[PDB]
Design a protein around this ligand. Structure first.
Ligand SMILES: Cc1ncc(COP(=O)(O)O)c(C=O)c1O
Ligand SMILES: *Cc1c(COP(=O)(O)O)cnc(C)c1O
Lengths: 380, 367, 371, 371
């Protein structure tokens, strides 16, 4: 369905229209200079080679261990419990191949990030979606989902802060999941891509802070959003040492490691001064504030996200009959603002659209003006 | 879990106990002698045309339904097998199907063949089955390929009216989800209650198939002869799968269908009287079990004071203390853990003996 | 086989008297003492414990072989269905099995049901079979899970000695490839011969199972009753699979199976010797006509090399010629694998007079043609 | 099984032995500055149009082949991964693919990971490869869906001419078996020899695709960039699976890739020359010691027949001896398929002084063995 709104947008650009594109999570801004300089400097050294070791260069797995200790007081063995990925999409897709085949089911929330589905369907797995929405007991539905699939699902894939809803959970959420996943012996994957994209002084919890999460869980983190990595993919997975090893084995038949100069560049991102991450977080918080306040002054009472790069907006009553896909087309044609239709994230999302905070503030104000002129011209 | 209770039962008889076996669902009764005689005489790809003509007449005479015997009917060696081959023809390996909970698992073998995965759908008092069915469809990605239903129902004895089927069929067509219906207990009905066929619903043949076995109606337990009727493209799919075998009870089985039918009535009558003894008996003992309106089963809710134990442990209690073997409800799914299933497959004297074994158990536990 | 069965029926609807030696179904009646028990018990998960005892005694008295009735034998609803279930128990979807070419396709149903791929191993005169079998084992990755064999063979009638099996078993142990052997035609033996069991090879049960269908030895076509013996862990696999499938094998057939296997074997001796006399009439008639066929020593088939003037036709089109011109239906050899395409199969399923009418139509065809 | 050889090597280093590592074929030389520069200054699923145009020009200039950049070309993330995805897009459980033996093990793996089974076809002096190749097609049911080839070859260094490819293509077209060709070593050619593309065969595109990686030609090892050309449907298939995975655009790397293809091509010739010089030193050195290895005509590899006195040890054991006695790590031929158990592979990935050091170790080992 995102193909549909990608086409309409591109048609609008080719018509010459000035479209505020708030429909993708591609960071707009530049990569921090220390990171780019390392990459370039290391690539230019005659002794450098692109290929590296199966699990990542030891110094980088060390940096990831340190990142866990410092942020979460969590122990990750760099030798056995950490592995460098070529971004989390690669990482996940490969964990699924290693772990899933025809005859297996994974559980995903609805609405959620569709990448987690594709990988599993590509690996041969079936997907069972679990409602994650206001006024439904998630833990009842998750436990139903486990009990009422035969055979039980091998795995459940969660991601907080959430894409697309911006939902944040505290540590007692993770305790429940973990105790539940151990009870039925279902593996937990957790996607921590938005851990640094956090507003109002809040911190994102890792699942690896629960005692014995390592016995049942793995956790993916990507550098894309925290460090504005554009046209570069790198991250890691940690936790259960057998799952880390199964990802290592599958990867050795696919790649020669992550591009070495990018791995060295990741060391410079993860180590040392993290002001560039706080600035990126801050830049999103203020874009959030212009968007949310502006939509509200126009009479669209959108909810204020506590994290992620997304405002997950409930379709106003007077347009609710249209559906998300139809509404998002209207926003594009009438307001000259590209959004993602909520239905693209699962059927429980059809009453919403998602905005990504990827244009600057003036542009955002221009998006708000376009939406407000639409309301006015529709008689609202 | 049935293997668990089939082995404790055989361990009890290993020990010289007089166990009243009400746990299998297999007729004790004699096959009508005219059918057995025709087997003796005969001994001296879609199935025999004659046998396929017989099902067509059957479908017309019972249900006013048109079945073309050239294309819309196929003989099977039983519904487990036929369901296996359909699944094989219709699923990609690993695909999903919908099974009610609680229900008799006629899919297990198909699941082994197709690598099928089951989404269990609650079919229980208190919950809206259609909302749950549509939910399970929607929430499985990709969509399930089929839903397997059976009325009258094993193990619940739940019967349905035509309007259920017109409602399943309308929903099936809405999501292009194939409907398989097992009419195995169509003749075992009580009190002028009657069993509709999903094929009475107009346009059913665009989305549904129906299986019937001879084993319950005619006491042909293990003769394994049945048939499938429905969509002609799915009949043809089965015929392909059967043709890979490249290959007498079929012939004998003609007598069952096109012969005199009083024996089918007499069989249902036998089960009805048996039902009356156990139900009456259990109730004298204060076990206020529901009277079934159809099928060979009494679906008994576990008395509150035995509720804590769960179906498995109550069944162990029953086997140890009352010398009666029952099917624990959880063998039919988690939504059956508060029941047991009795099969009316012993004689009435023996049903009485079981009633007295249950009573005493209750006398000794202070009820 | 469908093609030739359609042309045959076409010819009959046109009023032609076709001598059908194409189908392969026993025409004789089931011995009374067998039928008797089917009737009587009908009126009144591993197989009946008594029937598995009758299998155990069968192997002890015919092959001096110990088969433990409680763990090493199991009753089947025929060998085709029995093989499918074994395959479901031991194959992962998409795995490969080895099969001789040419051979009768008893594997096909299992292959489709278990999702198995097939690798054929040429089994023909002048090709080292063991070379090809091991080569087929080594050139497949992952290793094939099983090889399927059947001696006396359908369609070639080939017979092997006990040494052929001790090499198979020894090879199968080397690579850890399961052996399945089909003893179907063991009792259909001629001229004083006794057919050997793979289970006579010491430690055969470590790597192999053996299947017997009652159909051929006892005129029990359509009865769908046989057994498997061998490895206890493979038998237990089959017992599990079968428990999901059916409540149990039709007891009257099981008790009929006991009459067949226990006691007086005079009726199997008589069936054999009948096939022998039919063999002699067809083999002799065909040679008299300058069709120099091989003579089988077991089984019901005369595996007949296509005469050279008709070799360019292939087995399909030549068999069509037999049907059209001689009024005889044979099974083309290609239906058994491409390495059969210079043969046709004859089944000894008509009476001697009918077999002579065939030989006669065939003689006239050579005479009408150039030969 | 190259894990055993990599573990022994690491053990030796851990003991301070100076090991000349000629096992894993990892290019050791630097990427040309002009390529690497484009990484610094720049920092759909079919690829940047300009890159696909460069691909097109490369096929037109080198081979006189027309490849529509719109429909017949796709940027991969390198051949290893790109092939792995083509396999996931085209293969599942129930398929079999065909691979030579000995051959490049990474093809086998992508296929297996996708769930295909693999049938290997001997490609060795003394055996007729096309006869065995057609047998492998005909004797597997279902018939294999694809065959994967690569010349010049890893590990054997075999080079073929266009005549070879036009017989593959015709055989492929006769049986409708797709053909995958790996052109990774197109530029690593010696002594004026030249490697053809399967696309020079007219109608190749109806049945065939070709992979080329920038890794060897341009010392871009681990850069995760290449492309695939040929059949538009297999190209579209690769395109769709890429969309769903969304592993990334990697414009900087595509941009660098453009610099490789459009830049001065002398660096490629320099790279080939360097390997030709290292080959001259290893071949001449071994021969002076009395090990008369075949001179490769292309590829980073010397494919050395185990000398007769050591033949009996087999390749893994002879490789181990080479590491212990000569202080040289080689890859044992059996890791490439059973038909390679009589060779070892050297990779020309160490400089000439080091190659001299290897040779001296190997000579000292022949001398201590009295051979
Ligand atoms: C939940 C989540 N995980 C991962 C990613 C990005 O993954 P990668 O590291 O491959 O860039 C995103 C970007 O959309 C995301 O939203
Ligand atoms: C091409 C390549 C290889 C190939 O050598 P093998 O030892 O045969 O695997 C290895 N590593 C890299 C980085 C390569 O590019």
């Amino acid at each position: 369905v995102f193909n549909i709104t990608a086409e309409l947008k591109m048609a609008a650009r080719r018509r010459g229209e000035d479209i505020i594109d708030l429909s993708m999570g591609n960071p707009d801004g530049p990569t921090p200079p220390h990171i780019v300089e390392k990459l370039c400097t290391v690539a230019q050294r005659e002794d450098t080679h692109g290929y590296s070791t199966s699990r990542g260069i030891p110094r980088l797995r060390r940096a990831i261990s340190h990142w866990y200790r410092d942020r979460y007081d969590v122990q990750i063995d760099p030798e056995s419990e950490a592995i460098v990925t070529i971004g989390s999409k690669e990482g996940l897709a490969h964990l699924m191949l290693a772990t899933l085949d025809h005859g297996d089911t994974i559980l995903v929330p609805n609405p959620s990030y569709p990448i987690h589905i594709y990988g599993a369907v590509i690996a041969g797995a079936q997907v069972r979606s679990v409602p994650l929405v206001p006024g439904i007991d998630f833990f009842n539905e998750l436990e139903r989902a486990i009990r009422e699939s035969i055979p039980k699902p091998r795995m459940m894939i969660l991601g907080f802060p959430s894409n697309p809803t911006a939902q944040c959970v505290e540590l007692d959420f993770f305790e429940r999941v973990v105790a539940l996943a151990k009870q039925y012996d279902v593996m937990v994957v957790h996607d921590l891509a938005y851990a640094d994209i956090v507003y109002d002084g809040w911190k994102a919890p890792s699942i690896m802070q629960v005692p014995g999460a390592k016995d049942i869980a793995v956790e993916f983190f990507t550098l894309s959003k925290s460090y504005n990595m554009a046209g570069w993919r790198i991250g890691f997975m940690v936790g259960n040492p057998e799952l880390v090893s199964a990802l290592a084995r599958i990867k050795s038949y696919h790649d020669y490691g992550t591009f070495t100069p990018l791995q060295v560049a990741a060391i410079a991102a993860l180590e040392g001064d993290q002001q560039c991450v706080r600035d990126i977080a801050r830049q999103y918080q203020q874009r959030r504030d212009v968007l949310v306040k502006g939509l509200r002054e126009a009479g669209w009472m959108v909810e204020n996200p506590k994290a992620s790069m997304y405002v997950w907006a409930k379709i106003p009553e007077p347009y609710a009959h249209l559906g998300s896909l139809e509404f998002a087309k209207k926003l594009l044609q009438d307001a000259k603002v590209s959004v993602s239709p909520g239905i693209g994230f699962g059927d429980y999302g059809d009453d919403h659209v998602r905005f990504a905070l990827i244009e600057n503030r003036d542009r955002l104000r221009q998006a708000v003006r376009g939406i407000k002129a639409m309301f006015r011209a529709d008689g609202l």
